[PDB]
Amino acid sequence: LLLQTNLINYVTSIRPNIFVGRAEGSTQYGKWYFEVMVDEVVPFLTAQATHLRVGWALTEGYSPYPGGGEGWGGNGVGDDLYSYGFDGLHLWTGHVARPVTSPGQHLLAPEDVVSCCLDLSVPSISFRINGCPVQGVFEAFNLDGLFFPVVSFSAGVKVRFLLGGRHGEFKFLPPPGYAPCHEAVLPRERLRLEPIKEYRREGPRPHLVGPSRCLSHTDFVPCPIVLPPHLERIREKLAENIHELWALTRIEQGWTYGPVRDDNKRLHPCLVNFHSLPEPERNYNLQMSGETLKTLLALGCHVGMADEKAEDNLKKTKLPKTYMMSNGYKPAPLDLSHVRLTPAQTTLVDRLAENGHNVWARDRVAQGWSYSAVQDIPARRNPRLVPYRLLDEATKRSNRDSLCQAVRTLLGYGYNIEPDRVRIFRAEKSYTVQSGRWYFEFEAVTTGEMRVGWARPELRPDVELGADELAYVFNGHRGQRWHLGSEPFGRPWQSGDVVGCMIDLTENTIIFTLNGEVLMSDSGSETAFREIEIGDGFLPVCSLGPGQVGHLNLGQDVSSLRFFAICGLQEGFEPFAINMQRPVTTWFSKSLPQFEPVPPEHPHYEVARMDGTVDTPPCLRLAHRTWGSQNSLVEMLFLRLSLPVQFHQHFRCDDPEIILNTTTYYYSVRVFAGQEPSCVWVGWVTPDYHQHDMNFDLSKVRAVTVTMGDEQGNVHSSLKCSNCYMVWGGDFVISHTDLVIGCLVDLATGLMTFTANGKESNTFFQVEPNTKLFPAVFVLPTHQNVIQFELGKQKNIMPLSAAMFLSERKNPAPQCPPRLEVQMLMPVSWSRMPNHFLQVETRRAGERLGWAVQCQDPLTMMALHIPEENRC
């Protein structure tokens, strides 16, 4: 009921860049495996347990932050549904503890090696430690994202990872078919150990970053008619000139004439011309020419046939004495010295190379080959099967200048051709000012999406910063106004700029400075806006986009300011930190979406509770008033009632005498007429729900099959950990009569079969006993008054008010308090960074040991539970 607290740990997590994912036609193999060896971990440095476990997760939902979250506090792996954590005694997946039946079980002690094996097509997560696998696996999960290694470490942990065979050497040899992790590396990215969702790094003089943009799960997959008669023979002439350009650089470097073909002997069978080429070699250039002329009008490039005299007047290139080999024959390519490189088609032949060779990646993956940094012809391995903007630039011009010998040649032939989210970095509202004059700066080591300026403490992070009347901010990537519009003022940035803002609120002057020089507008005034009312005062605000670096210059010591002694030190301005005993804690927005209560003065949606009649009980429903014109953007709402029901702990294994002993309670929803029943989803959602997208459904929900057993392979029990135990409103369904979808919870055994219009459906689900579920519906409304929860009960089943709290469990009068009102998730909130973090560092000695992560900072933190929602 009330709010308790205890001291809790700090956790962060480190992660290497091994990104493995699938689709329909994917570049993967499906088998990857790694180890971690444990040698330096403290037993108990802090009060609580040393949070130490390994696991793998997917990038879209798992995001550990040291401040806030669900549970007690200190959330790493195993603390959510996306990750699969295991410390040695219990397989943690979603705030659970499941016993594991292995001989000689213990936690991650030193001088042991901990690992897990994972495969991709059929789900299987097995764990491997101490020479014999443990008897517990996970399967049947959703893989809508990519894989990554990630570890959980508390204070006083020094561990190294056994990477592969290149920069490591595995003590445990893998089973046949399991490939090591060391070759799923992107070519232009060196294998880097970077923490997930970081917003702060330790620099030369603590600098803060934004979210690094993750590679999409629709990015690695390769995705790609008529025959004009005026380009038929010249499509073979272009293949013949391609054979000439094949032989021209070949005879100059060592390709000689020979009836055989050999790699080391440099023997060419096609060194004379295209006419001396055999039949399997001529149709190869013919099928390449056929593949490359069909994609001309596939984009919209208008090609016309004109100037028949110029191509005939163009002769061949001149041949030197040393340009022709010891064969006696010479190729005659067309000299494109009269052709010019165009910047318009230079941007198109950069895309046609991808258009021509992602179908090459298509065709190699359809034969069944995979991706690795090593190639191996018995294992059908190659570093070639990549998308083109994931390919490194060692292959870029070796592909494009090989194919660019045809496009300016067809030009000279006479044929003309025609052409996550953003974070907001701000202080707390108790550090604001109302009188005087202050100043900050901003150093921008990366020119990107920076927002610098000042704002108001009643800041709404729902609106994009710069579009409402709560912030007066500066643009510099384009350089203008952002307040109730946009109009030009100022200069673009430079990589390493110092930009700040000061306000003379004595006479409401806004002054932006660029490296000591003050900028003026198009009118000639160096000040930006006037006539600002003070009101609640200003707040130092900043905002950083996806994937850039830039820190907030506070100015505690005067010598740490560099560009304030040039401008503004004489006229009276002072830095913000005039009398500071401690560094300021500036809050920042999180891209973790969670729930926030309904304001009563909302211009879009309203809710209200009814009175209590005999025929209809006192209930609540939703209504929409701005349904019509004037920009009514309506989207799928996610209603919830903010209080849970916790079940019975150990299971059992009308007349008043039959209602007093049973534990089953039923509620329903009744959708009003004229609404789409296909987008109505009714049921119960656990607190493990931190996602928001615009078209969710029950195909996009995750459930992990947990089962354990004996060492011989037999099964013992099966367990399903899910977060969305709901159904489809259109499963049984301009309807004129309303329809009913119900949910009943039997607390004694835990089985939940949902009923519709007085008749039972087919889908059943069971949950672990010591979890809780919130009553929630996900409904897109297609008119005004749609959703109607009912606080009712039929002749043999008690309502929800009995299972609500303790003081009313056996009275069948259903009434609804204003403590329970509707709950809606908005995708932005405010959390806080602490003033001291975990200074982590990476080290390795030796070539086969592995890169080690260290920590040495002992840190604990006072954190609360609020057990009516379970959010630390």
């Binding site: 000689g104 079980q105 010591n770």
Partner: protein, 107 residues
């Protein structure tokens, strides 16, 4: 009836009998995942000896079966530790108690 599960392997050499003082560096946590007791917060090892009827009988028989360096997990049913009402302000009546214990020194 109490179920015991070890956590970290210890000695297996000395398990206590009558006439032996013992130190246990214990932590307590109920079945719904809430903290109620510890000696981590103390920086003191708890000192007692067996057979003085000091600890409750669901702990006095589980504390005589372990050894040095041994971390165990004991899940006490409510019938063996304050069945009827119990200590006011500490444990609600008939709730299971789960202790993860560690023996420090002194047999």
């Amino acid at each position: 009836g109490v179920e015991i599960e070890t956590i970290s392997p210890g000695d297996g050499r000395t398990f206590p009998k009558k006439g032996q003082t013992c130190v246990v560096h214990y932590t307590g946590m109920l079945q719904n995942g809430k903290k109620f007791d510890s000696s981590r917060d103390r920086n003191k090892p708890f000192k007692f000896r067996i057979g003085k009827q000091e600890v409750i009988k669901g702990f006095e028989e589980g504390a005589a079966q372990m050894s040095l360096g041994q971390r165990a997990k004991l899940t006490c049913t409510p019938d063996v530790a304050y069945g009827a009402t119990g200590h006011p302000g500490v444990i609600p009546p008939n709730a299971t108690l789960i202790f993860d214990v560690e023996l420090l020194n002194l047999e």
